[PDB]
Ligand SMILES: O=C1O[C@H]([C@@H](O)CO)C(O)=C1O
């Protein structure tokens with residue numbers, strides 16, 4: 001269980017990825033890295049995980065990703081892939097299993113346009129995590145409700161269970177991690193004028209891949225308190 | 240030639256796209272829409288163009304794209320695709336001809352990672368267009384030089400003529416429009432510590448697709464002066 005402890009400044013650079021496996025450089029509480037892990041699980045891809053201490057990074061990690069961000073994929077050929085959506089698309093294409101993106105070009109384009117509709121939400125969550133008082137909170141509630149009604153409208157026309165059809169697909173996994181953290185951020189009442197989006201969240205929680213990877217509110221809250229202080233122990237909260 | 244005049248507020252909504260053609264909603268001076276037009280030309284795709292008056296938009300255009308931005312693709316089946324990179328990827332997949340993206344998943348992922356390396360540049364150009372004096376200009380020069388050295392490093396390792404190999408490909412067309420406007424913005428001396436990137440620009444200008452679509456400095460400058468004043472005649476400069 002302590003096998004999951006993060007590597008930080010001073011850690012030895014890791015050795016090569018074994019043939020037959022792919023490696024993800026991750027952090028247990030990162031919603032960006034969660035995207036990639038949901039895909040690895042959904043597709044049944046054998047993999048290893050190296051967690052990175054984002055508040056005390058190893059210098060060698062910048063050789064994996066010059067941006068110094070998680071997630072990063074590394075394969076046995078030594079190829080390196082970064083940016084969460086890029087890593088997810090690469091896995092869908094490079095591995096067998098349930099295809100998570102549509103083959104049809106228009107339907108694929110639709111999933112990417114829905115990701116665009118969503119793309120303000122990660123930056124807002126970033127802002128929210130920093131909110132100081134009830135006035136700031138009232139305002140961020142309105143900002144989230146505007147973004148959520150964009151997403152509600154997609155579901156309203158499609159009349160489908162999920163954003164790509166009646167079966168969960170790539171787009172759902174790409175947006176899920178921010179919704180998972182919404183309870184914990186006290187932002188559930190932003191989805192109260194968006195009834196189909198609320199039902200979508202209930203459906204997501206029933207998905208075997210989502211349920212396997214869900215972090216408890218108490219664990220995310222422990223992480224967050226330490227992260228907001230730039231604690232070098234945040235990323236290993238619980239361990 | 241006046242066939243290219245933009246549609247603005249009050250214009251009638253256009254009729255259906257004919258079978259055998261795709262329609263692009265564009266603007267002659269938009270670098271985002273230029274991406275899509277470079278792809279249409281590179282692939283030899285039969286198409287029609289409707290230019291939109293971005294400073295006096297038709298209300299119906301928001302039914303084509305709720306964001307109200309160009310480019311937008313519309314096909315004879317009535318499907319609508321927006322966001323410049325999405326439109327380009329859709330065309331590469333949906334049409335025959337020279338494939339502009341690699342089939343190999345890693346090499347495709349590499350092109351998307353290079354687009355990420357570039358992705359600060361459009362926002363910087365946006366800021367530059369607004370620059371007031373020599374001090375602001377000196378600063379933006381340093382910002383551009385930082386972004387350009389990221390791109391130089393890609394070319395340095397690859398030792399290839401273009402960002403995807405020795406043959407021009409999607410990634411080159413996606414980044415080109417901002418480099419085309421660099422002379423006009425007086426920012427050529429930002430590429431003077433980036434010699435491979437300077438050679439890339441010379442190579443791009445020799446490409447038949449790029450050369451066919453290049454706008455003159457004088458025409459772009461006429462456009463820009465009117466655009467900065469929110470002139471409803473900017474988009475039709477020259478007509
Ligand atoms: O700020 C971030 O955005 C990226 C990217 O992976 C998502 O597209 C990432 O990993 C972060 O930590």
Ligand SMILES: O=C1O[C@H]([C@@H](O)CO)C(O)=C1O
Pocket residue numbers: 271272308309310321322323324
């Ligand atoms: O500001 C813009 O960015 C978009 C997009 O098309 C690019 O990805 C666009 O068209 C604009 O006018």
